[PDB]
Amino acid sequence: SPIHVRAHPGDVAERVLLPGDPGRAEWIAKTFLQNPRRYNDHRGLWGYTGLYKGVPVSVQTTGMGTPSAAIVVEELVRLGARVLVRVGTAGAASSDLAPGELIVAQGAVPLDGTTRQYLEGRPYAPVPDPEVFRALWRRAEALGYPHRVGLVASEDAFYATTPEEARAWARYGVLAFEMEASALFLLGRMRGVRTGAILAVSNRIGDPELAPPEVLQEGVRRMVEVALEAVLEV
Amino acid sequence: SPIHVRAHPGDVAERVLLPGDPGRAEWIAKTFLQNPRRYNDHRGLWGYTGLYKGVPVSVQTTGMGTPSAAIVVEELVRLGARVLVRVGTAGAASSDLAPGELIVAQGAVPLDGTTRQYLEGRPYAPVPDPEVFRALWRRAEALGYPHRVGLVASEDAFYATTPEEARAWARYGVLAFEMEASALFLLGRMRGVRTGAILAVSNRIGDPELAPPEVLQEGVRRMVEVALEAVLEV
Amino acid sequence: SPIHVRAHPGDVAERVLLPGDPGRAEWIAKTFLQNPRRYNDHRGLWGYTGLYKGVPVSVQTTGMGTPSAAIVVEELVRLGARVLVRVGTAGAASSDLAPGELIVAQGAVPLDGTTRQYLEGRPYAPVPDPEVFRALWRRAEALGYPHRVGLVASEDAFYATTPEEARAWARYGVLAFEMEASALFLLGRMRGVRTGAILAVSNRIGDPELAPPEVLQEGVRRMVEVALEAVLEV
Amino acid sequence: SPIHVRAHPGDVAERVLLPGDPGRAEWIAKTFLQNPRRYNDHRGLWGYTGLYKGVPVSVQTTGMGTPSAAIVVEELVRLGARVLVRVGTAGAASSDLAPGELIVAQGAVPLDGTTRQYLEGRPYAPVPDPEVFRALWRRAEALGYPHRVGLVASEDAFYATTPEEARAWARYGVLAFEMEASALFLLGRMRGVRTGAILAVSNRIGDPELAPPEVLQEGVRRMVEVALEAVLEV
Amino acid sequence: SPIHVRAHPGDVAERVLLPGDPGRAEWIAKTFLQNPRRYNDHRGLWGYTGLYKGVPVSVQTTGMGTPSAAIVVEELVRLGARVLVRVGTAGAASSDLAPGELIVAQGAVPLDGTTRQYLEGRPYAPVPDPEVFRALWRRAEALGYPHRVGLVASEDAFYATTPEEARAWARYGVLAFEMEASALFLLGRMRGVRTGAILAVSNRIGDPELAPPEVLQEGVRRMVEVALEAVLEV
Amino acid sequence: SPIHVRAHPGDVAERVLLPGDPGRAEWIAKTFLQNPRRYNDHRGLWGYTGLYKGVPVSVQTTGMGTPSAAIVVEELVRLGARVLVRVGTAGAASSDLAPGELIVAQGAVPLDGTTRQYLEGRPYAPVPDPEVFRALWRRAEALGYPHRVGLVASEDAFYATTPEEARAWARYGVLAFEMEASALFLLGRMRGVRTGAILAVSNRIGDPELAPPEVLQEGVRRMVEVALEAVLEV
Ligand SMILES: Nc1nc2c(ncn2[C@@H]2O[C@H](CO)[C@@H](O)[C@H]2O)c(=O)[nH]1
Ligand SMILES: Nc1nc2c(ncn2[C@@H]2O[C@H](CO)[C@@H](O)[C@H]2O)c(=O)[nH]1
Ligand SMILES: Nc1nc2c(ncn2[C@@H]2O[C@H](CO)[C@@H](O)[C@H]2O)c(=O)[nH]1
Ligand SMILES: Nc1nc2c(ncn2[C@@H]2O[C@H](CO)[C@@H](O)[C@H]2O)c(=O)[nH]1
Ligand SMILES: Nc1nc2c(ncn2[C@@H]2O[C@H](CO)[C@@H](O)[C@H]2O)c(=O)[nH]1
Ligand SMILES: Nc1nc2c(ncn2[C@@H]2O[C@H](CO)[C@@H](O)[C@H]2O)c(=O)[nH]1
């Protein structure tokens, strides 16, 4: 059994969804999974397994920052995870992106040290599994939920980045900022597993808060659905 | 008129293919375009323009390496380019990819100094325009030629990379090595244009001479077809 | 109201202890604090407050990795924290440190990208607040608890570091490897608060499992005693 | 036979001039070489060999950029090149250097990524072969053609540097910018062959094109003469 | 015998004060040492050995900059040195450190290349030996002289750092700029010896000369005393 | 009055030789200069100004390391120094160079932190002033003294380079290792003065000492002689 996500074989499922917030996790469990079960809760890393249209699905809590995610991801794989999709939030770096809108992450600028440490300092292009990426983009499109398809950025210092610094990054193709996608993608390739990431804009960089409960909450919901449907596909 | 690609106000089309070998360029313009016209030969950077299935299409030689390629791209853009797709060759990072196989660049691991100079040393994830990428994958499917979808890596010292080094990069998801994608993908986002890349494996890193030219020429043809069909998609 | 540690001024007491996993927080709260009040549980960042020997002391969850620890320390500062000491666990890099022993953080070798992004590439030497450091030190002696005073390393990739890399680092002085010390020390100076760090060696790098539960809890128990007594002396 | 310079052993002399643009290669071959013969035109890398004052000399196109130039040089040495002199143009980094003036490159600040790949990121000082360097200088004086002797800078991204950043480098001794020298100088030392570089200023950094036509040409003619005289001396 | 400090093993004592200027060494040796004798004067690295209250103590010159300092510290270790304390001057980075004030070095920010070459580009936290650090501190209060305890930055280019950049560092907690501590501390750990540093502020970066001849000299004296006492304990 | 080199205006000549050893300075002053007169002794940085064949010339100790030399060069130039040439020692990188041999420094690989601080981490090619570089070479020949022409490597940590690494560097053209060239060369350009460096090989990297004192001394005498003839040239 792992050191963090203390689970034994049989708990985790093939397809797994990775949420940073232990809350959204639970809310996913109770809201989309039949007879959801919680295999782990150690370190607040709440994780559940239930069924979605029969198919076994999982929902494991990564935490905040590629370091924590990496630890959980690495362990979910050792436990049996084959298809993991991130279900999180982000901070818009532009203005064209309004809160609640969804983003299918094409790739992730590695502004984190975790991927760096794994790459021993080498450059890289973290990208999801083309099948998963394709799947998310397709279930989104099929469901009719307006979205965006592009780049994000996985930083480490939440309060370091400034609106201005973000404006510049946007000129490079970055749409918003998150804190786990880059590592998910690296390990994804590194360990021979398919990974993906879908994000809900919960605010624009420069402002001290999230979005009017309902606006973002729908997003968080649309996102979670597209995710689930995509995995069952891959 | 641009410094290198000395084309005029009305010579370049919105949809352009970017081969590195001026030789391949000319061949495409003759084998696929109607009423083909060479608008430039300065510096051996042959660029042709004509009609493909009633749609205006251009073929511009980029040369080898991102330094050469960024100059050409930067100039195609101020010349009208809007959809630029790279039709090139690459060396497989490992043995699971044979010569003549197609690779649809999902992203490019930036091991070049050109993107490094443009990004002032900042990390980044050179990825194509999702739309164009999506197309390339579909026409590759439609036409039904043996291919792959994933990461390639753009290097600078062609003769630097060792077979041992390549295989390590393979353990990071890189399927093959080439010398342009990265910058194109970068400039694409920087100058708001949709770009893409499709490569035809011409050898496995470590070989003295490329494999049977008949098998590589056919690989090339398939690539150019997909690419041309895909540019009409966007 | 912080964006992550959804609290309010008055909830957090000047002197604060910072454990990595909430489970250990609760323990400390319920165990050493009278009338403990968990003012936050958002994102699993369990944060309590209560009386210790007649002085309001707090217990805040940082999460794993300096990225998560950064946000917590950054908000704890916005709420009114002045004396923040981390009470954690680490993996010994040397073959001389015994499981269950204590380590007073004289400094933290910055091997994480959080501190890095906050410094913008600049070289630094992350150290605690002079006094706190001196506090943790003088107590651990008056309390006859065998401990060590020296350097620890702060990393992002928990599973990257192999025993061999660890011994190498031990040659420079790294006693063990943890994951929150550096950014805590950094922010200490950056924000103006007094920080510190004491740790419990839970294992020897490269090993899949800790040692006898009994020993590891008495090491942590001690750690908090040596800690709580200090935050009051400064 | 090499991959890019499809030529046989005896198709290349011991002494070689390396112009970046194939049109000048051809011009040189015709304007200066006796009984010159084109031994390659693959990928537009026009290469001619003939006699200059009874001695054989080759004029080989390198292409734009160190990656391309590196490939060319590597194969040339494989082909028997022993003395390679780059004969190209450059953008002045200061208002004192006027179009047409010549520059005997004493060294090249390595702003390119090719050298870096070969240097695995180590610092370095790309300098020519002392004997070659001195002959160029000497002949320039012998021919009474005015010139400058100093550093040039080799970059990757032509359109990245601005009039500001360039003259900034001037304050470090950078006379002008180009895109091949550094890789040539490094490889000269790595493979053990004598290399040198001379340049015809084609414009001042900040201008949309170049200067008055005849001026530059007379500069190029002098440049090639100096280079030709020199290679026969070493 | 060592290449630079040409002394005999019996010459260097266990405890050693490390002044940067040979003028201060000679002074120390003659002001505080009983029956002092110079054991070396090669390369002007004046080194003296004497008795300070029954105990033998050496005062070795290091020169300016970590390269000179590292050469010295390395050879002193090889000649039996166990405890080395740097008694140098420094430049205030902020306005709260009027010259004459004392600084007990807790850590030294590595802005030098000596520690960079040793560490092989790896990050680090140069710090003194705990017990030695503790001693200096205690003796300063004991003897009762106004002092400050914190960080100092070790740089290579004295005339580089500008008045602004200093305040920029002040914001990360740098108390002053000197030129040796970092390497002394790194070697301290590598070669297993006890090192420390107590500085005497001489100016405020951006200063052309110095301050009141009177003040600076008194501060220096106290310094040498806090240092001489200290070493006696450890 | 400069801070370190406390010389009055007019004490230092236009031409100056730069030995790193104050013992060598005095010897040079009293060996080759007519009417030698020391103008500074502060910090063992011995400085002399006498006459060489009627021409005023100064010899100024730089100390060991680029941070030191950098300081003295900055100060001499501010004093009026115009032609500064280093006359020092260095250890051969391979069996290619024997003790007592002269090296005319064509360029200096910057492995030091000083040039890196000035340069702000940017790549660079430290070269001597072209005319001075030439006069040295020119005088080397006329005098009949056996010498090599090429690269050296200016490093910071004397005791850090392994014999192995020296060989790795030889592969890239580095002839020997020393500790001042690079900075002297960067300041040369930065401050508009003419510089150069001639070296006497005193050993091979690896050996714990030096060669036969009578062998090296003649190398030193030839070195100085060449430099003196040279400085009068420009
Ligand atoms: N860095 C960053 N992460 C954000 C932002 N908004 C939401 N997040 C995500 O949610 C967490 C922070 O609450 C991180 O794990 C991110 O992935 C933002 O503006 N910046
Ligand atoms: N770097 C690299 N490029 C290759 C290889 N094989 C084909 N190419 C491509 O074709 C050119 C080199 O022949 C470059 O422009 C590449 O994009 C290979 O093994 N390595
Ligand atoms: N990186 C690292 N963290 C450790 C180790 N042992 C305990 N930890 C700590 O506990 C968490 C990982 O379980 C991190 O938050 C660390 O601070 C170890 O061997 N390595
Ligand atoms: N980077 C750069 N290369 C230049 C410039 N002017 C001429 N060149 C040279 O000519 C090509 C660009 O036109 C490159 O191959 C360079 O070697 C200039 O201003 N900048
Ligand atoms: N870098 C630096 N060193 C200083 C300063 N003031 C005194 N020093 C010290 O004294 C020498 C420079 O005079 C160096 O050896 C330093 O350790 C200052 O402002 N900056
Ligand atoms: N780094 C280094 N410097 C050397 C060597 N031999 C002589 N030196 C020079 O002389 C001093 C070291 O003795 C430094 O100031 C160098 O410039 C050597 O082998 N390595």
Side-chain angles (χ1 to χ4, degrees), chain A residues 68-91:
Chain A
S68 188
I71 288 183
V72 175
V73 183
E74 280 261 42
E75 276 167 46
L76 280 179
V77 153
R78 216 181 301 251
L79 289 167
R82 290 291 157 286
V83 170
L84 320 75
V85 177
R86 179 156 154 60
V87 281
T89 54

PDB file of all heavy atoms in Angstrom, chain A residues 68-91:
ATOM      1  N   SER A  68       2.096  17.813  -4.755  1.00  0.00           N
ATOM      2  CA  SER A  68       1.074  16.965  -4.144  1.00  0.00           C
ATOM      3  C   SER A  68       0.392  16.084  -5.189  1.00  0.00           C
ATOM      4  O   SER A  68       0.228  14.885  -4.988  1.00  0.00           O
ATOM      5  CB  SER A  68       0.037  17.843  -3.420  1.00  0.00           C
ATOM      6  OG  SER A  68      -0.865  17.066  -2.652  1.00  0.00           O
ATOM      7  N   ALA A  69      -0.001  16.682  -6.307  1.00  0.00           N
ATOM      8  CA  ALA A  69      -0.655  15.927  -7.365  1.00  0.00           C
ATOM      9  C   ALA A  69       0.226  14.757  -7.754  1.00  0.00           C
ATOM     10  O   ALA A  69      -0.202  13.598  -7.709  1.00  0.00           O
ATOM     11  CB  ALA A  69      -0.891  16.810  -8.558  1.00  0.00           C
ATOM     12  N   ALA A  70       1.468  15.077  -8.113  1.00  0.00           N
ATOM     13  CA  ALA A  70       2.458  14.087  -8.533  1.00  0.00           C
ATOM     14  C   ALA A  70       2.483  12.895  -7.590  1.00  0.00           C
ATOM     15  O   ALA A  70       2.496  11.741  -8.027  1.00  0.00           O
ATOM     16  CB  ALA A  70       3.849  14.733  -8.603  1.00  0.00           C
ATOM     17  N   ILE A  71       2.493  13.180  -6.293  1.00  0.00           N
ATOM     18  CA  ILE A  71       2.511  12.125  -5.296  1.00  0.00           C
ATOM     19  C   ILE A  71       1.272  11.246  -5.425  1.00  0.00           C
ATOM     20  O   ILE A  71       1.362  10.015  -5.419  1.00  0.00           O
ATOM     21  CB  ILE A  71       2.570  12.711  -3.879  1.00  0.00           C
ATOM     22  CG1 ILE A  71       3.960  13.302  -3.621  1.00  0.00           C
ATOM     23  CG2 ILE A  71       2.260  11.640  -2.869  1.00  0.00           C
ATOM     24  CD1 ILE A  71       4.164  13.859  -2.202  1.00  0.00           C
ATOM     25  N   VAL A  72       0.114  11.881  -5.559  1.00  0.00           N
ATOM     26  CA  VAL A  72      -1.129  11.135  -5.678  1.00  0.00           C
ATOM     27  C   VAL A  72      -1.189  10.399  -7.018  1.00  0.00           C
ATOM     28  O   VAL A  72      -1.467   9.202  -7.071  1.00  0.00           O
ATOM     29  CB  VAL A  72      -2.353  12.090  -5.505  1.00  0.00           C
ATOM     30  CG1 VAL A  72      -3.658  11.345  -5.747  1.00  0.00           C
ATOM     31  CG2 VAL A  72      -2.349  12.670  -4.093  1.00  0.00           C
ATOM     32  N   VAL A  73      -0.912  11.114  -8.099  1.00  0.00           N
ATOM     33  CA  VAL A  73      -0.939  10.503  -9.419  1.00  0.00           C
ATOM     34  C   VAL A  73      -0.047   9.262  -9.465  1.00  0.00           C
ATOM     35  O   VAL A  73      -0.488   8.177  -9.856  1.00  0.00           O
ATOM     36  CB  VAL A  73      -0.455  11.486 -10.490  1.00  0.00           C
ATOM     37  CG1 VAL A  73      -0.572  10.859 -11.873  1.00  0.00           C
ATOM     38  CG2 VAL A  73      -1.255  12.766 -10.406  1.00  0.00           C
ATOM     39  N   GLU A  74       1.209   9.431  -9.068  1.00  0.00           N
ATOM     40  CA  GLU A  74       2.165   8.333  -9.074  1.00  0.00           C
ATOM     41  C   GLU A  74       1.614   7.119  -8.342  1.00  0.00           C
ATOM     42  O   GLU A  74       1.794   5.979  -8.780  1.00  0.00           O
ATOM     43  CB  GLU A  74       3.475   8.773  -8.417  1.00  0.00           C
ATOM     44  CG  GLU A  74       4.383   9.585  -9.325  1.00  0.00           C
ATOM     45  CD  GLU A  74       5.490   8.749  -9.936  1.00  0.00           C
ATOM     46  OE1 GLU A  74       5.220   7.606 -10.364  1.00  0.00           O
ATOM     47  OE2 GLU A  74       6.631   9.246  -9.995  1.00  0.00           O
ATOM     48  N   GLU A  75       0.936   7.371  -7.229  1.00  0.00           N
ATOM     49  CA  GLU A  75       0.378   6.295  -6.434  1.00  0.00           C
ATOM     50  C   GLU A  75      -0.886   5.672  -7.022  1.00  0.00           C
ATOM     51  O   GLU A  75      -1.097   4.474  -6.880  1.00  0.00           O
ATOM     52  CB  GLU A  75       0.143   6.787  -5.002  1.00  0.00           C
ATOM     53  CG  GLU A  75       1.399   6.690  -4.144  1.00  0.00           C
ATOM     54  CD  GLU A  75       1.296   7.448  -2.838  1.00  0.00           C
ATOM     55  OE1 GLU A  75       0.265   7.319  -2.142  1.00  0.00           O
ATOM     56  OE2 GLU A  75       2.260   8.168  -2.501  1.00  0.00           O
ATOM     57  N   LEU A  76      -1.716   6.478  -7.679  1.00  0.00           N
ATOM     58  CA  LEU A  76      -2.937   5.970  -8.296  1.00  0.00           C
ATOM     59  C   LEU A  76      -2.575   4.986  -9.397  1.00  0.00           C
ATOM     60  O   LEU A  76      -3.284   4.008  -9.635  1.00  0.00           O
ATOM     61  CB  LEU A  76      -3.758   7.110  -8.898  1.00  0.00           C
ATOM     62  CG  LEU A  76      -4.629   7.948  -7.959  1.00  0.00           C
ATOM     63  CD1 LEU A  76      -5.330   9.015  -8.763  1.00  0.00           C
ATOM     64  CD2 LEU A  76      -5.644   7.059  -7.257  1.00  0.00           C
ATOM     65  N   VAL A  77      -1.462   5.253 -10.068  1.00  0.00           N
ATOM     66  CA  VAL A  77      -0.996   4.401 -11.151  1.00  0.00           C
ATOM     67  C   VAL A  77      -0.505   3.065 -10.616  1.00  0.00           C
ATOM     68  O   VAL A  77      -0.769   2.016 -11.200  1.00  0.00           O
ATOM     69  CB  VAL A  77       0.151   5.083 -11.920  1.00  0.00           C
ATOM     70  CG1 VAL A  77       1.054   4.042 -12.547  1.00  0.00           C
ATOM     71  CG2 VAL A  77      -0.417   5.999 -12.982  1.00  0.00           C
ATOM     72  N   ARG A  78       0.218   3.118  -9.504  1.00  0.00           N
ATOM     73  CA  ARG A  78       0.755   1.916  -8.888  1.00  0.00           C
ATOM     74  C   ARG A  78      -0.424   1.065  -8.405  1.00  0.00           C
ATOM     75  O   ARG A  78      -0.329  -0.163  -8.317  1.00  0.00           O
ATOM     76  CB  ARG A  78       1.665   2.307  -7.719  1.00  0.00           C
ATOM     77  CG  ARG A  78       2.895   1.426  -7.525  1.00  0.00           C
ATOM     78  CD  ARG A  78       3.725   1.896  -6.316  1.00  0.00           C
ATOM     79  NE  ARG A  78       4.188   3.284  -6.436  1.00  0.00           N
ATOM     80  CZ  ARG A  78       5.457   3.644  -6.639  1.00  0.00           C
ATOM     81  NH1 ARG A  78       6.409   2.720  -6.748  1.00  0.00           N
ATOM     82  NH2 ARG A  78       5.779   4.930  -6.740  1.00  0.00           N
ATOM     83  N   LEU A  79      -1.541   1.737  -8.120  1.00  0.00           N
ATOM     84  CA  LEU A  79      -2.760   1.083  -7.643  1.00  0.00           C
ATOM     85  C   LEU A  79      -3.632   0.568  -8.791  1.00  0.00           C
ATOM     86  O   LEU A  79      -4.534  -0.234  -8.567  1.00  0.00           O
ATOM     87  CB  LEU A  79      -3.579   2.049  -6.767  1.00  0.00           C
ATOM     88  CG  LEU A  79      -3.074   2.430  -5.368  1.00  0.00           C
ATOM     89  CD1 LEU A  79      -3.864   3.617  -4.818  1.00  0.00           C
ATOM     90  CD2 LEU A  79      -3.213   1.238  -4.439  1.00  0.00           C
ATOM     91  N   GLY A  80      -3.381   1.037 -10.012  1.00  0.00           N
ATOM     92  CA  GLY A  80      -4.166   0.565 -11.148  1.00  0.00           C
ATOM     93  C   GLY A  80      -4.845   1.582 -12.053  1.00  0.00           C
ATOM     94  O   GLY A  80      -5.616   1.209 -12.935  1.00  0.00           O
ATOM     95  N   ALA A  81      -4.572   2.863 -11.850  1.00  0.00           N
ATOM     96  CA  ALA A  81      -5.183   3.897 -12.679  1.00  0.00           C
ATOM     97  C   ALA A  81      -4.565   3.879 -14.078  1.00  0.00           C
ATOM     98  O   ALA A  81      -3.340   3.867 -14.212  1.00  0.00           O
ATOM     99  CB  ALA A  81      -4.975   5.265 -12.037  1.00  0.00           C
ATOM    100  N   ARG A  82      -5.406   3.882 -15.113  1.00  0.00           N
ATOM    101  CA  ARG A  82      -4.921   3.872 -16.495  1.00  0.00           C
ATOM    102  C   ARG A  82      -5.313   5.127 -17.258  1.00  0.00           C
ATOM    103  O   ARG A  82      -4.570   5.578 -18.131  1.00  0.00           O
ATOM    104  CB  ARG A  82      -5.431   2.632 -17.234  1.00  0.00           C
ATOM    105  CG  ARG A  82      -4.779   1.344 -16.746  1.00  0.00           C
ATOM    106  CD  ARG A  82      -3.307   1.293 -17.148  1.00  0.00           C
ATOM    107  NE  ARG A  82      -2.503   0.406 -16.303  1.00  0.00           N
ATOM    108  CZ  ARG A  82      -2.131   0.682 -15.053  1.00  0.00           C
ATOM    109  NH1 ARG A  82      -2.485   1.821 -14.482  1.00  0.00           N
ATOM    110  NH2 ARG A  82      -1.393  -0.180 -14.369  1.00  0.00           N
ATOM    111  N   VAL A  83      -6.480   5.680 -16.930  1.00  0.00           N
ATOM    112  CA  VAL A  83      -6.994   6.899 -17.570  1.00  0.00           C
ATOM    113  C   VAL A  83      -7.429   7.922 -16.520  1.00  0.00           C
ATOM    114  O   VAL A  83      -8.498   7.786 -15.916  1.00  0.00           O
ATOM    115  CB  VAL A  83      -8.207   6.605 -18.479  1.00  0.00           C
ATOM    116  CG1 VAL A  83      -8.852   7.906 -18.913  1.00  0.00           C
ATOM    117  CG2 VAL A  83      -7.767   5.808 -19.703  1.00  0.00           C
ATOM    118  N   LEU A  84      -6.598   8.947 -16.327  1.00  0.00           N
ATOM    119  CA  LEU A  84      -6.862   9.998 -15.351  1.00  0.00           C
ATOM    120  C   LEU A  84      -7.031  11.365 -16.000  1.00  0.00           C
ATOM    121  O   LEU A  84      -6.180  11.820 -16.773  1.00  0.00           O
ATOM    122  CB  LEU A  84      -5.731  10.055 -14.331  1.00  0.00           C
ATOM    123  CG  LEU A  84      -5.228   8.678 -13.902  1.00  0.00           C
ATOM    124  CD1 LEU A  84      -4.373   8.072 -15.028  1.00  0.00           C
ATOM    125  CD2 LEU A  84      -4.413   8.801 -12.621  1.00  0.00           C
ATOM    126  N   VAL A  85      -8.136  12.019 -15.664  1.00  0.00           N
ATOM    127  CA  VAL A  85      -8.472  13.333 -16.191  1.00  0.00           C
ATOM    128  C   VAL A  85      -8.605  14.344 -15.064  1.00  0.00           C
ATOM    129  O   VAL A  85      -9.298  14.089 -14.077  1.00  0.00           O
ATOM    130  CB  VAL A  85      -9.808  13.294 -16.931  1.00  0.00           C
ATOM    131  CG1 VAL A  85     -10.175  14.685 -17.422  1.00  0.00           C
ATOM    132  CG2 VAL A  85      -9.729  12.308 -18.075  1.00  0.00           C
ATOM    133  N   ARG A  86      -7.949  15.490 -15.206  1.00  0.00           N
ATOM    134  CA  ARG A  86      -8.036  16.524 -14.185  1.00  0.00           C
ATOM    135  C   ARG A  86      -9.379  17.239 -14.305  1.00  0.00           C
ATOM    136  O   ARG A  86      -9.864  17.507 -15.406  1.00  0.00           O
ATOM    137  CB  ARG A  86      -6.885  17.522 -14.341  1.00  0.00           C
ATOM    138  CG  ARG A  86      -6.897  18.659 -13.332  1.00  0.00           C
ATOM    139  CD  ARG A  86      -5.498  19.239 -13.145  1.00  0.00           C
ATOM    140  NE  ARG A  86      -5.496  20.635 -12.710  1.00  0.00           N
ATOM    141  CZ  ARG A  86      -6.051  21.089 -11.587  1.00  0.00           C
ATOM    142  NH1 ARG A  86      -6.671  20.261 -10.753  1.00  0.00           N
ATOM    143  NH2 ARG A  86      -5.982  22.380 -11.297  1.00  0.00           N
ATOM    144  N   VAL A  87      -9.997  17.509 -13.161  1.00  0.00           N
ATOM    145  CA  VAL A  87     -11.275  18.220 -13.117  1.00  0.00           C
ATOM    146  C   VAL A  87     -11.048  19.366 -12.155  1.00  0.00           C
ATOM    147  O   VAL A  87     -11.283  19.231 -10.954  1.00  0.00           O
ATOM    148  CB  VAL A  87     -12.417  17.338 -12.562  1.00  0.00           C
ATOM    149  CG1 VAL A  87     -12.924  16.393 -13.645  1.00  0.00           C
ATOM    150  CG2 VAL A  87     -11.924  16.554 -11.349  1.00  0.00           C
ATOM    151  N   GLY A  88     -10.581  20.494 -12.673  1.00  0.00           N
ATOM    152  CA  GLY A  88     -10.313  21.600 -11.787  1.00  0.00           C
ATOM    153  C   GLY A  88     -10.757  22.963 -12.252  1.00  0.00           C
ATOM    154  O   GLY A  88     -11.556  23.115 -13.178  1.00  0.00           O
ATOM    155  N   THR A  89     -10.217  23.969 -11.577  1.00  0.00           N
ATOM    156  CA  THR A  89     -10.521  25.353 -11.863  1.00  0.00           C
ATOM    157  C   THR A  89      -9.241  26.027 -12.298  1.00  0.00           C
ATOM    158  O   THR A  89      -8.154  25.466 -12.146  1.00  0.00           O
ATOM    159  CB  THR A  89     -11.042  26.072 -10.612  1.00  0.00           C
ATOM    160  OG1 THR A  89     -10.104  25.894  -9.542  1.00  0.00           O
ATOM    161  CG2 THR A  89     -12.410  25.512 -10.201  1.00  0.00           C
ATOM    162  N   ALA A  90      -9.385  27.238 -12.828  1.00  0.00           N
ATOM    163  CA  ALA A  90      -8.251  28.015 -13.288  1.00  0.00           C
ATOM    164  C   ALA A  90      -8.532  29.494 -13.116  1.00  0.00           C
ATOM    165  O   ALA A  90      -9.624  29.887 -12.704  1.00  0.00           O
ATOM    166  CB  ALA A  90      -7.970  27.709 -14.752  1.00  0.00           C
ATOM    167  N   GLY A  91      -7.525  30.303 -13.421  1.00  0.00           N
ATOM    168  CA  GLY A  91      -7.658  31.744 -13.339  1.00  0.00           C
ATOM    169  C   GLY A  91      -7.343  32.286 -14.723  1.00  0.00           C
ATOM    170  O   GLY A  91      -6.253  32.062 -15.242  1.00  0.00           O
TER     171      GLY A  91
END
